[PDB]
Write an enzyme that holds these catalytic residues in place. Structure first.
Site, PDB file in Angstrom:
ATOM      1  N   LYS A   1       0.624  -1.297  -0.023  1.00 18.41           N
ATOM      2  CA  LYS A   1       0.016  -0.027  -0.032  1.00 18.41           C
ATOM      3  C   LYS A   1       0.816   1.366   0.033  1.00 18.41           C
ATOM      4  CE  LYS A   1      -3.929   2.694   0.618  1.00 18.41           C
ATOM      5  NZ  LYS A   1      -5.426   2.844   1.050  1.00 18.41           N
TER       6      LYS A   1
ATOM      7  N   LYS B   1      -6.284  -7.125  -3.033  1.00 16.95           N
ATOM      8  CA  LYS B   1      -6.223  -8.453  -3.697  1.00 16.95           C
ATOM      9  C   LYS B   1      -4.842  -8.840  -3.206  1.00 16.95           C
ATOM     10  CE  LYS B   1      -8.730  -5.833  -6.298  1.00 16.95           C
ATOM     11  NZ  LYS B   1     -10.128  -5.642  -7.157  1.00 16.95           N
TER      12      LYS B   1
ATOM     13  N   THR C   1      -8.342 -14.481 -30.204  1.00 20.62           N
ATOM     14  CA  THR C   1      -7.302 -13.594 -30.304  1.00 20.62           C
ATOM     15  C   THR C   1      -5.973 -14.052 -30.757  1.00 20.62           C
ATOM     16  OG1 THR C   1      -7.824 -12.061 -28.265  1.00 20.62           O
ATOM     17  CG2 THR C   1      -5.653 -12.746 -28.214  1.00 20.62           C
TER      18      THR C   1
ATOM     19  N   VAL D   1      -5.699 -15.809 -33.146  1.00 18.42           N
ATOM     20  CA  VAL D   1      -5.501 -15.649 -34.633  1.00 18.42           C
ATOM     21  C   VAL D   1      -5.052 -14.181 -35.160  1.00 18.42           C
ATOM     22  CG1 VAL D   1      -7.117 -15.942 -36.861  1.00 18.42           C
ATOM     23  CG2 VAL D   1      -7.215 -17.529 -34.505  1.00 18.42           C
TER      24      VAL D   1
ATOM     25  N   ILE E   1      -7.169 -11.430 -35.510  1.00 16.98           N
ATOM     26  CA  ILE E   1      -8.089 -11.288 -34.690  1.00 16.98           C
ATOM     27  C   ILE E   1      -7.446 -10.605 -33.412  1.00 16.98           C
ATOM     28  CG2 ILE E   1      -9.544 -12.225 -32.707  1.00 16.98           C
ATOM     29  CD1 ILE E   1     -10.534 -14.166 -35.107  1.00 16.98           C
TER      30      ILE E   1
ATOM     31  N   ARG F   1       7.656 -22.216 -34.069  1.00 18.19           N
ATOM     32  CA  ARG F   1       8.757 -21.511 -33.920  1.00 18.19           C
ATOM     33  C   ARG F   1       9.494 -21.725 -35.443  1.00 18.19           C
ATOM     34  NH1 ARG F   1       9.903 -16.994 -30.725  1.00 18.19           N
ATOM     35  NH2 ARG F   1      12.230 -17.641 -31.107  1.00 18.19           N
TER      36      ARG F   1
ATOM     37  N   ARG G   1      20.844 -12.081 -33.713  1.00 16.68           N
ATOM     38  CA  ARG G   1      21.231 -12.170 -32.581  1.00 16.68           C
ATOM     39  C   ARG G   1      21.800 -13.669 -32.345  1.00 16.68           C
ATOM     40  NH1 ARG G   1      16.885 -10.009 -28.548  1.00 16.68           N
ATOM     41  NH2 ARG G   1      16.014 -11.633 -30.073  1.00 16.68           N
TER      42      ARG G   1
ATOM     43  N   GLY H   1      10.580 -16.404 -34.358  1.00 17.34           N
ATOM     44  CA  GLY H   1       9.217 -16.303 -34.630  1.00 17.34           C
ATOM     45  C   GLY H   1       8.647 -15.975 -35.783  1.00 17.34           C
TER      46      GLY H   1
ATOM     47  N   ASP I   1      12.101 -10.936 -40.271  1.00 16.44           N
ATOM     48  CA  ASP I   1      12.011  -9.458 -40.527  1.00 16.44           C
ATOM     49  C   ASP I   1      13.201  -8.985 -41.427  1.00 16.44           C
ATOM     50  OD1 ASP I   1      10.447  -7.301 -38.753  1.00 16.44           O
ATOM     51  OD2 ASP I   1      11.117  -9.204 -37.314  1.00 16.44           O
TER      52      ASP I   1
END
Ligand code: NA
Ligand code: NA
Ligand SMILES: [Zn+2]
Ligand SMILES: [Zn+2]
Ligand SMILES: [Zn+2]
Length: 327
Positions: free
Chosen positions: A52, A64, A93, A95, A98, A141, A175, A181, A184
């Site tokens: 807090k 919480k 999501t 997709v 999406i 991957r 790198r 993924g 680029d």
DNA sequence: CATTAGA
DNA sequence: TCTAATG
């Protein structure tokens, strides 16, 4: 870094939830700053009240924290984690094409699953179509083994089209990284820079090339400087075809490639870090340039760069192989 | 933090 | 034009 691990994670779960399921940008923005500062707090949070004291934590999150500290869980968390509507959004999501908006919308019409998606492919646009179609390969991957093959092919066509072309496959792949993924590819040409009013064909030619030989199979988005698509390594002598992979090619004004290339290679930390150094060393580094710092508080005037070298030199650092741009 | 789609 | 989505 772990001393406050769980608290930060419950907190992310929470924020993430406001943001997607509901549209509580604030609650959601709320959760994140909290998750930011408690993460930093150099001590083990023992109770809400303690938490807090933090800036960002209010009575809400304090609460919480207690319950979680108290019992190894959170009810609100348990409930959301359970609930199908929320589950569904987090899923749609996944997709490409999406987002939360369409996810909530499809949900509200009853499209909850991947099948549902099929049955209603009409309700989907082109991006989303492709996304659906390559859902599987899209989650996969990229082996570096494959990365080098790919790279090989792109580089050659680019060259064959115009020898003046300059391309760099940035990313993790750059790198060293064992997998990546998507690919680029940073692109620039000499006849294209800061001033010299465009040359869209410059991008467009290569895109066309790549498709011409089937390296590029689909088009997610094609503009005058950025092309987002899908490519695929020629499925050899059959028995094995290669999974469909995400690919982004981008046009750079030759007068700001390296900043860009430098930039995109990361790592996120290498950046900031490189970025923080240039500041002491009297500069400014960003996506496209490096400007000398002026005492008046700020200043401008774009330093002339011919390689990743010049940049370092500037901030007078050790050239770090991309291999070691890890932090 | 910026580019492309879309409707 | 705004708004979405990906980066
Ligand atoms: Na406070
Ligand atoms: Na998605
Ligand atoms: Zn302590
Ligand atoms: Zn990437
Ligand atoms: Zn990408």
């Amino acid at each position: 870094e772990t001393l406050n691990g769980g608290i930060t994670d419950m907190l992310t779960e929470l924020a993430n939830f406001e943001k997607n399921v509901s549209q509580a940008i604030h609650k959601y923005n709320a959760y994140r700053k909290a998750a930011s500062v408690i993460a930093k707090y150099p001590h083990k949070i023992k109770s809400g009240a303690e938490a807090k004291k933090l800036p960002g934590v209010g009575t809400k999150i304090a609460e919480k924290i207690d319950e979680f500290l108290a019992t190894g869980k959170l009810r609100k968390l348990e409930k959301i984690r359970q609930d199908d509507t929320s589950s569904s959004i987090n899923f749609l999501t996944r997709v490409s094409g999406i987002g939360p908006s369409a996810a909530r919308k499809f949900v509200d019409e009853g499209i909850k699953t991947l099948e549902d998606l099929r049955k209603n492919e009409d309700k989907l646009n082109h991006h989303q179509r492709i996304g659906l179609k390559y859902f599987g390969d899209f989650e996969k991957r990229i082996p570096r083994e494959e990365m080098l093959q790919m790279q090989d092919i792109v580089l050659n066509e680019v060259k064959k089209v115009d020898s003046e072309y300059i391309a760099t496959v940035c990313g993790s792949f750059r790198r060293g990284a064992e997998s990546s993924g998507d690919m680029d590819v940073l692109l620039t040409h000499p006849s294209f820079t800061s001033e010299s009013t465009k040359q869209p064909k410059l991008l467009h030619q290569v895109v066309e090339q790549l498709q011409k030989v089937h390296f590029i199979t689909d088009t997610l988005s094609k503009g005058e400087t950025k092309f987002m698509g899908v490519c695929q390594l020629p499925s050899k002598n059959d028995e094995k075809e290669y999974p469909h992979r995400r690919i982004d090619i981008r046009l750079i004004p030759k007068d700001q490639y390296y900043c860009g290339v430098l930039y995109f290679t990361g790592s996120d930390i290498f950046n900031k870090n490189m970025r923080a150094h240039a500041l002491e060393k009297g500069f400014t580094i960003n996506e496209y340039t490096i400007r000398p710092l002026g005492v008046t508080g700020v200043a401008g005037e774009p330093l002339p760069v011919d390689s990743e070298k010049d940049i370092f030199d500037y901030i007078q650092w050790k050239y770090r192989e991309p291999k070691d741009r890890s932090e």
